[PDB]
Structure formats: C-alpha cells, structure tokens
Ligand SMILES: C[C@@H]1O[C@@H](OCc2cnnn2CC=O)[C@@H](O)[C@H](O)[C@@H]1O
Ligand SMILES: C[C@@H]1O[C@@H](OCc2cnnn2CC=O)[C@@H](O)[C@H](O)[C@@H]1O
Ligand SMILES: C[C@@H]1O[C@@H](OCc2cnnn2CC=O)[C@@H](O)[C@H](O)[C@@H]1O
Ligand SMILES: C[C@@H]1O[C@@H](O)[C@@H](O)[C@H](O)[C@@H]1O
Ligand SMILES: [Ca+2]
Ligand SMILES: [Ca+2]
Ligand SMILES: [Ca+2]
Ligand SMILES: [Ca+2]
Ligand SMILES: [Ca+2]
C-alpha cells in the first residue's frame with residue numbers, strides 16, 4: 001500500500017520534524033502539492049533533529065514525505081493518529097538497509113499550530 | 115484515565131522532543147522510574163522546539179510526561195503507536211487554556227534509536 | 229479531555245461493534261448527531277461480541293459512544309487511527325471498576341464500508 | 343514493509359474478529375508461532391462479522407494474519423495502538439482489487455481479556 005502520503009485541511013499551517021538513526025546520511029524531502037517545500041540532510045545514530053519547519057498545506061492539502069540515502073529511496077511505513085478529536089499526528093518511518101528497525105529517518109508531522 | 119504514562123522495554127534508549135503552541139511559557143518534565151530525568155521550557159506560537167534529548171528507560175521502563183503552564187498542570191492526552199511491529203511512538207498533547215486545541219505543548223517519544 | 233466523540237465523514241455508513249470483558253453487565257450507547265442510534269448489552273469475561281451494527285453518520289457526521297454498568301457511566305479512553313490515508317478506525321475502551329484494564333466494554337468503529 | 347505481524351505478551355489470551363466488505367469471499371488465517379490457530383471465511387458488502395474467536399499467544403507471542411481471496415494473497419496494511427498504557431489494538435486492512443479501499447477484509451485483534 002502507498003505510504004508517506006497525507007491529506008491535510010487546505011491552507012493550514014503544520015510542523016514537520018525529521019530525526020536520523022543510521023550510519024548513512026539521510027535526505028528527507030517534504031512535498032506540498034507535488035512540489036518540494038522543505039529539505040533536510042544529515043547523519044546521526046543518536047536521534048538528532050536534522051530539521052524542523054513550519055509549512056502551509058496550500059490549496060490541495062496534499063503532503064508527501066520521501067526519504068533517500070545517497071540517491072537510493074528508503075522503504076517507508078506510515079499512519080495518522082488523532083487524539084481527543086482535535087490533535088493530529090502524521091508518522092513516518094524509513095528503512096535504508098536490511099535490519100528492519102525502520103528508524104533510519106523518522107518524520108513527524110503535527111497540526112494544528114498556534 | 116491516566117495519560118502521559120508509558121511502559122517501555124527495560125534499559126532502552128529513547129528520544130524525547132517538545133514543541134510549543136501557546137501565549138504562555140510551557141514547562142515539560144520527563145520522569146523515569148518516578149524521578150525527573152529531563153526538563154524543557156520555552157514559549158512559541160509557531161511550533162518551535164523547546165527541547166530535545168536522549169534518555170535511558172532504566173530497569174523499570176516506566177516513563178511519564180508532565181506539563182505545567184502559568185503555575186498549573188495542563189490536561190494531557192496520549193497514545194502509543196507501533197508501525198511494522200518495530201517502530202514505536204509515544205505521543206502527548208496538552209491544554210493550558212479554554213480553547214481545547216491540545217497543542218499548547220506537544221511531546222513526541224520515539225524508540226528504538228541507533 | 230473529552231473522549232468517545234468522533235467527527236466522521238458526513239452522510240457516510242460505518243460499522244460499530246462492541247466486546248465485553250467484565251463480571252458486570254455492560255450497556256453501550258451510540259449517538260449520531262446527539263440522538264441515540266444504537267444500544268448493545270451483555271455480560272462476558274471472554275470478549276463476546278455483544279452487538280454489531282451498520283449506521284449512517286448523518287448530515288453533521290458527529291458520533292458519540294457512551295458506556296454504563298448498572299446505571300453508572302464508565303470512564304472512557306479513545307483515539308482515531310488512519311491507515312494508508314484512507315482506512316479509519318475509531319477506538320473506545322471503558323473502565324467500570326478499579327483494576328484499570330479498560331477492556332470492560334471495548335467499542336470499535338470502522339469506515340468506509342462496501 | 344511487512345504487515346499483519348504482531349508480537350503479543352507470552353501466554354496471553356486475545357480476541358480476533360474479522361469483517362468483510364467485498365464481492366469476493368474472504369479467507370482469513372490466524373497463525374500463532376507460525377502454525378494455523380484459526381480460519382474464517384465469508385462474503386459481505388455490509389461489514390458482516392465473518393468470524394470471532396479467543397486464542398492464546400503461546401510461548402513466542404508471535405501472531406500473524408493472512409488474507410486471501412480465491413487463493414490470491416491480499417495486500418495488507420496494519421498498525422498497533424495502545425490506550426492508557428493498558429488496552430491494545432492490533433488492526434489489519436486488506437485489498438483484493440484495484441480500488442484501494444483496503445476494507446475487503448478488516449481484522450481487529452484485542453488484548454487483554456477478562
Ligand atoms: C548503524 C546502522 O546503520 C544502518 O545500516 C548501515 C547502513 C549505512 N548506510 N546504508 N546502510 C544500510 C545497509 O547497510 C541502518 O540500516 C541500521 O538500522 C543501523 O542504524
Ligand atoms: C471480572 C472483573 O469484572 C470487573 O470487576 C468487577 C465489577 C463487576 N461489576 N462492576 N465491577 C467493578 C467494581 O467491582 C472488571 O472491572 C474487571 O476488569 C474484571 O473484568
Ligand atoms: C464490491 C467491491 O468488491 C471488490 O471488487 C471486486 C472484486 C471481487 N473479487 N475480487 N475483486 C477485485 C477485482 O475486481 C473490492 O475490491 C471493492 O473494494 C468493493 O468492495
Ligand atoms: C495563543 C493562545 O495561547 C493560549 O491561550 C492557548 O491556550 C491557545 O491554544 C493559543 O495558543
Ligand atoms: Ca535500519
Ligand atoms: Ca537504524
Ligand atoms: Ca490551548
Ligand atoms: Ca495552542
Ligand atoms: Ca475493569
């Protein structure tokens with residue numbers, strides 16, 4: 001099934017935050033309406049915040065997360081969870097190798113803000 | 115029901131990150147085995163990261179998040195999500211006022227690391 | 229925080245199903261736009277499916293779950309999970325006593341159907 | 343990523359329930375420690391319960407759900423959610439066709455019981 005794709009409410013601010021847990025350099029691209037809106041890069045085996053930004057969902061509300069290591073796309077897992085019918089979390093995990101811990105690049109999207 | 119309390123696997127390192135979305139200054143305390151292990155503080159209405167840290171779950175694995183604003187504990191909402199039977203997220207939202215957006219302090223715990 | 233309340237897609241069919249794990253007789257009420265649409269009841273300590281039904285969410289889409297044992301309201305926990313940006317589960321747990329297993333009446337709401 | 347595989351606590355009773363939303367007959371296999379423990383089969387486009395049972399997780403705690411339609415394995419989506427650090431849901435969606443509604447056979451695993 002398709003992973004790493006979420007439909008947010010239109011014209012709404014959201015936060016996007018990436019973590020790294022691998023010996024390979026992670027490249028995280030965040031797409032809004034099929035165009036790159038944010039990009040983060042870095043290497044960590046200690047859960048370093050390789051980037052965090054505030055973006056607008058735009059007219060479409062389509063947000064996609066892609067992860068690659070030196071050009072090679074990582075396998076993705078994702079889900080969305082809503083607490084008390086108000087607070088939203090869009091969660092992404094990625095695997096760049098064989099051990100299947102899926103933490104090599106972890107991406108968290110949260111809304112609403114303010 | 116009790117919220118913001120999580121049982122992690124014993125002696126496992128986890129990441130903890132806090133965001134702020136309120137007029138008031140947020141104080142986030144992270145407890146391990148019923149003792150304070152980390153404390154974050156700051157103010158933002160733009161989802162700024164007020165703290166991030168790597169901790170150990172210890173012998174018991176019991177981890178608790180508490181949030182205080184303007185001298186009063188915030189109301190908490192929480193849940194744990196596990197993707198592909200490997201990647202764990204422990205999510206916390208909090209409310210300090212009357213609008214019930216529950217984003218005033220957002221806390222994300224993730225494991226395993228490395 | 230308010231629990232057991234969910235905003236479903238308007239005018240859409242959903243499935244609601246209840247399980248029982250208590251020595252006390254459970255009563256589950258399902259409200260659609262603030263009016264009782266379904267009621268299930270039973271007594272089992274072995275996860276008996278005391279009721280399953282298909283309902284329409286109506287013009288507003290507001291769905292609420294309430295649980296009571298001998299006329300006393302049970303404490304509720306709830307969350308919504310979305311898989312592959314399409315498949316939805318609204319989950320409810322309830323506690324009628326003091327052991328805090330929160331499984332005394334478990335309610336699962338799923339959509340879309342068909 | 344692998345889907346439909348869950349690690350439960352050892353020697354623990356759990357409930358497994360399957361729903362159907364497809365013109366094709368759904369066959370659901372539940373494996374405990376890599377051996378078939380339960381099999382459900384049925385057809386519905388109205389979310390009918392095609393089977394429910396209580397099983398023991400055994401010494402390993404490994405539980406796997408498989409879905410097939412007329413011999414053809416369905417693509418699976420899954421996640422585990424824990425409420426108030428006590429109540430566990432293991433959730434499975436499956437797709438047998440081209441529309442990608444992933445509800446053709448829906449499987450809900452819940453624990454603890456009693
Ligand atoms: C330290 C390790 O780093 C990666 O493995 C090592 C690695 C480094 N670049 N690509 N890979 C995958 C193929 O070898 C990662 O997959 C593993 O979970 C650990 O975090
Ligand atoms: C068999 C037990 O049943 C309930 O407890 C016992 C019970 C029966 N009716 N109400 N109560 C709550 C006050 O005692 C329930 O809370 C507990 O988790 C077990 O499933
Ligand atoms: C009524 C429909 O039934 C299936 O489609 C029709 C069908 C019936 N058997 N296999 N397929 C897949 C290829 O045609 C299913 O995938 C779809 O979501 C609807 O529930
Ligand atoms: C700017 C406002 O500050 C406090 O009143 C919060 O309770 C609100 O959610 C909002 O963020
Ligand atoms: Ca890895
Ligand atoms: Ca890793
Ligand atoms: Ca607020
Ligand atoms: Ca706020
Ligand atoms: Ca109880």
Ligand SMILES: [Ca+2]
Nearest residue numbers: 249331332456
């Ligand atoms: Ca019980």
Ligand SMILES: [Ca+2]
Nearest residue numbers: 439442443444
């Ligand atoms: Ca389908």
Ligand SMILES: [Ca+2]
Nearest residue numbers: 342363445446
């Ligand atoms: Ca279907």
